Amino acid sequence: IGSIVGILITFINGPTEVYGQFLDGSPPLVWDKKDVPENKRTFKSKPRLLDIVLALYSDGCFYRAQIIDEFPSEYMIFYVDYGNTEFVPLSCLAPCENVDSFKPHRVFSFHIEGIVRSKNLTHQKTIECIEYLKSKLLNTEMNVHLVQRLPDGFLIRFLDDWKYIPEQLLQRNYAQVS
């Protein structure tokens, strides 16, 4: 039915919130080191705040990122199609062409309905919950029920194949009910 949409989870923002793309069949926006030879690897002007560039992630592949902060020795960057924040130096950055740069940003924020992060969650337990959700949901394609639109993003509810995830979060005291 029409309330069910397909999403790909790319990043775990918190115990009850993940970042992800809507599934529409279009291939991912990522570049091999083989498709970034060094003519395309150096800018005409040193990059700056809010510029949209290619950036090198831990997997050795380039992704679209926006510089959201600048310091003398590092940039702080946000991957616009994946939603994780990193710190990089200029050597990790490559100019991104306007045809690829103009494509809309694919990352959005989804909240699991009916649960929130536990108030008593310690720093360590928070890290551990993030790792559990990474083990289950990271880079996973699945249909979900788009319950609602929010100012932040979307409120989704899991279907029968993934409805155990909020149950486990409640069971493991990573989450409480809203």
């Binding site: 790909l8 291939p27 990271l138 880079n139």
Partner: peptide, 4 residues
């Protein structure tokens, strides 16, 4: 393709 996507990250693993």
């Amino acid at each position: 393709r996507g990250r693993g």
